[PDB]
Specification:
Number of domains of chain A: 2
Radius of gyration of chain A: 21 Å
Largest interface: A-B, 42 and 42 residues
CATH topology of the largest domain in chain A: Dihydrodipicolinate Reductase, domain 2
Order of helices and strands of chain A: EHEHEHEHEHEHEHEEEEEHEEHHE
GO cellular component, one term (chain B): cytosol
Helix content of chain A: 25-40%
Oligomer: homodimer
Strand content of chain A: 15-25%
Protein name (chain B): scyllo-inositol 2-dehydrogenase (NADP(+)) IolW
Keywords (chain B): NADP, Oxidoreductase
CATH superfamily of the largest domain in chain A: Dihydrodipicolinate Reductase, domain 2
Family (chain B): Belongs to the Gfo/Idh/MocA family.
Function (chain B): Catalyzes the reversible NADPH-dependent reduction of scyllo-inosose (SIS) to scyllo-inositol (SI). Cannot use NADH instead of NADPH. May be involved in reduction of not only SIS but also various oxidized compounds manifested upon stressful conditions.
Amino acid sequence: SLDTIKVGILGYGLSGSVFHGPLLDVLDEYQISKIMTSRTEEVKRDFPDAEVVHELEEITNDPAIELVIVTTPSGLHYEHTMACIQAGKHVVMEKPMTATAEEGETLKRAADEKGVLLSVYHNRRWDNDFLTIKKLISEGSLEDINTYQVSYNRYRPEVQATGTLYDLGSHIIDQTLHLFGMPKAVTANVMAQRENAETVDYFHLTLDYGKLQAILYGGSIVPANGPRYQIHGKDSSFIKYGIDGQEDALRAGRKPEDDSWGADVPEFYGKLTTIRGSDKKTETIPSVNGSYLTYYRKIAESIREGAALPVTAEEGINVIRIIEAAMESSKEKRTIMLE
Amino acid sequence: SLDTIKVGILGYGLSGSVFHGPLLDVLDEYQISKIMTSRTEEVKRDFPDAEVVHELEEITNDPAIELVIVTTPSGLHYEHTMACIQAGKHVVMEKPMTATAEEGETLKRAADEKGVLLSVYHNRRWDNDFLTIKKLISEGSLEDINTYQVSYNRYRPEVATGTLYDLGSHIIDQTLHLFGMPKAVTANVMAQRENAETVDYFHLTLDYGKLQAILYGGSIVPANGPRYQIHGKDSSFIKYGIDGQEDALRAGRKPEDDSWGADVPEFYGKLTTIRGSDKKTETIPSVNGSYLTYYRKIAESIREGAALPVTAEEGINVIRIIEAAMESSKEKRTIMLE
């Protein structure tokens, strides 16, 4: 194929080698050409045909390179992204996009100025549970949602853009923005519960959409999780436990190769309750398979065909906007309204 | 028995006739003597030996009456309560105690000056689920609770009033009973329903520092999540369902045997405990709910000088939490408690 998109991957830690590499590897739309890393042997074993490089320029000055994936650590990655944009490369950034909305806008304007595609890897829009929710919404089984409550907890009692609101909160904020647009206000408590904690490990956010209230919360001393989603509309409620299995499959060295990729466990299928007049019906909904590949098939369609991006820089920046307003709400102890 | 506590009941609507009358009726420590209502025929069927009266003074100026249950509507009940206190009567008030904490303080002060017992019927302290939670805590099975989330929802899509006073007061009282007063309250209190003129949704955060207590409920909720999600250093308790006693009372049943207030097995809660790497979940059979316990204690207070099952001060604190929440919702900011 003359038309493979030539990819350079920045960094080959966990994101590069586990979350991106294996997905890019199964899509013939793509060719992994270069990877910036000192893990020379790992790359030789994972991608025999890739070239290892140790300088950013070896990617930014290479005219054959069309798309750069930025997985370098939170600090140095703004620099790297700008450098890629300056060199006329399309760029996929990890979440959370940046620490501040202002940094994010700067990248967006530089990309627009330069005619390049800038996206943010908010791949939890292709988690099984979330896909299931979008399917229920589109089929009219979850009308006029009035309450949307999402929890994202862990049990990590020992302390091992920092903290869990950036790292985990960003995913469920993106989902919320995706579903309902921007809220008119944010009220939040953002803290460190754990004994010697440096960074945020607890958040509770309320996104004010008037009649609709979106509540997003997460703790780090939570032996057992309640439901991940509790969603209430005029006629029905969707309540579901569990988390998407794709990241664990990827950590176990598995690749997407058949239709059973991203399947949910039957015990974790959501329950939809519907009330028509006097009758109350409860149904177990088999989850739509999770499909992280979809983000990359769409990126390929933006690059080659000019189709709209699967996640846009603006949507990425909006997540950061909610995160900063939450921090500000927590610090000032008041509701932060948004224009 | 020469020693029955002689009861006067004010009002014979739902509270009087369904939630108090039938409990007092099975306890031989009490005699229902007088009921102030216009429902004369109804009292005649239910309590053939009670006297019906039509003015308050027929109860307050009767030297034999020792205890008065105030079930008259929220508005006229501050007035009613004060007269009972002024006449030297012990009083049980329905929840919520009063619209404002200031009103509750006045009632308490007059009770203390007059030397009578003043209590509030926060009977949810004896719901099956909450008794089970309390038992877990006392056995050391929920140590160092860091998160306590309680939901109190209903599906009423068609329209001291509103659900914060009516429902939220129950789960607030439980929270205060477990943990004391928090440092701050942050709340949103509104009407979500299209034609609502009164509160029908609340979401409160009580700030205890590391511990966060979240109390909420809406009125357009087809299926509830857990009523309780409680997380501590080693363990979590998650539980669905509501205590069945009030429904039994509505259907006309009375406490008669050991089966009263039993929870349904499918709504038993789950305790998850983590021991280093070993995580285990155990189903916890619920302790039976026991509203009678409230009234047995009241009788021990009156006859033996025991401490009240719910004090006026506790009742007032519930109201202080409610006012701080309304104020937080209006000012769109966190309200610090004094």
